[PDB]
Amino acid sequence: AGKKVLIVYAHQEPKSFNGSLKNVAVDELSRQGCTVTVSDLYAMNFEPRATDKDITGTLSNPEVFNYGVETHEAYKQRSLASDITDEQKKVREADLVIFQFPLYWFSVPAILKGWMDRVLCQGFAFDIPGFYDSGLLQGKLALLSVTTGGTAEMYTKTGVNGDSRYFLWPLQHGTLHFCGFKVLAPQISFAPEIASEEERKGMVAAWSQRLQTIWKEEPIPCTAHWHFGQ
């Protein structure tokens, strides 16, 4: 229907399994009539470091630099660097944000971690108070579409890696729920380098097939119980 989608994509290689999942997302959401934007972070050379270069004006305190204080104040004053504000505009307009990435060290690749660190600033994505259920991005949906080297069996409670949900907690709860997103159940595509040609093809189509009905899903309960059990 009339919905805007931002895909934040973090993979160096267009011909990759990630590039395929990103392209089927664009193809399918386009086909439905959605408005679609992609931030391809590596192709943008997106800057991941949180530095004093992200504020253009007089610093609230130039003697002792505090990145969170200075960016909050820069956001209010409109003196944040324009690569940050460009991304904030995409996220403000979007109804659903999809993050497409390969799992690196049980988390996102650094370039994507830098997008989170720099774009989700105080005043824009949350305030104090104004976080978790009162976060500023309330009304928006987010979804992580994650690829892994490890197999599904490896990511079970009694597997070596532990359950897949355990690694989702900092991203789903600590970032996305904190900012007020409702979180849709993650898409995890396990061990596509191991899988056969039929199996990889089935994983791509399972994602295209899920996206056909994405606007009918309910969000997960983004609680400790969902992630950890017990």
Ligand X SMILES: COc1ccc(OC)c2c(C)cc(=O)[nH]c12
Ligand Y SMILES: Cc1cc2nc3c(=O)[nH]c(=O)nc-3n(C[C@H](O)[C@H](O)[C@H](O)COP(=O)(O)OP(=O)(O)OC[C@H]3O[C@@H](n4cnc5c(N)ncnc54)[C@H](O)[C@@H]3O)c2cc1C
Is 150 known to sit in a ligand binding site?
A: yes
The radius of gyration computed from the CA coordinates of the chain, to the nearest angstrom, equals 18
Helix (H) or strand (E) holding 110: helix 110-119
To ligand X, the closest distance from the beta carbon of 211 in angstroms equals: 26
Task: Tell me which of ligand X, its own copies, Zn ion, none is bound by residue 76, counting a contact when its beta carbon lies within the kind-specific cut-off of 5 to 8 angstroms.
Answer: none
For residues 49, 90, 104 and 174, what is the CA-based torsion angle, rounded to 10 degrees? 90
Binding pattern for the stretch 64-103 against ligand Y, x by CB under 6 A and - elsewhere: x-xxx---------------------------------xx
149 forms part of the interface with ligand X (CB under 6 A): yes
- 175 by Cβ neighbours in 10 Å (0-12 / 13-18 / 19+) ranks as buried
Task: Name the nearest CA neighbour of 46 among 91, 14, 12.
Answer: 12
Among 59, 81, 185, 204, binds ligand Y (CB under 6 A): 204
- Is 55 annotated in some ligand binding site? no
Q: How far apart are CA 153 and CA 165, in angstroms?
A: 13
Residue 181 CA to residue 136 CA, distance in Å, equals 8
> Degrees (nearest 5) of the Cα angle 69, 70, 73?
85
150 lies in the site for ligand X, by CB under 6 A: yes
Question: Left, alpha or beta for 94 (phi > 0: left; psi -120 to 50: alpha)?
Answer: beta
82-93 and 110-119 helices cross at what angle (nearest 10)?
A: 80
Is the Cβ–Cβ distance between 71 and 122 less than 8 Å? Answer: yes
Using CB under 6 A as the binding rule, the residues of this chain from 11 to 70 that contact ligand Y are 11, 13, 15-18, 20, 50, 64, 66-68
Do residues 146 and 155 touch, judged by C-beta distance below 8 A?
A: no
- Closest contact distance (angstroms) between CB of 198 and ligand X is 21
- Draw the binding track, 105-144, toward ligand Y (x: CB under 6 A; -: no contact): xx----------x---------------------------
Can you give the binding site for its own copies, defined by CB under 8 A?
A: 12-13, 15-16, 42, 45, 48-52, 63-68, 104-111, 113-114, 116-117, 120, 128, 132, 149, 157, 160-163, 166-167, 169-171, 173-175, 178, 193, 224, 227-230
Q: Which among ligand X, ligand Y, Zn ion, none contacts residue 128 (Cβ within 5 to 8 A by kind)?
A: ligand X
229 binds, options Zn ion, ligand Y, ligand X, none, Cβ within 5 to 8 A by partner type = none
- Judged by the rule CB under 6 A, the positions of this chain that interact with ligand Y are 11, 13, 15-18, 20, 50, 64, 66-68, 102-106, 117, 147-150, 174, 192-193, 197, 200-201, 204
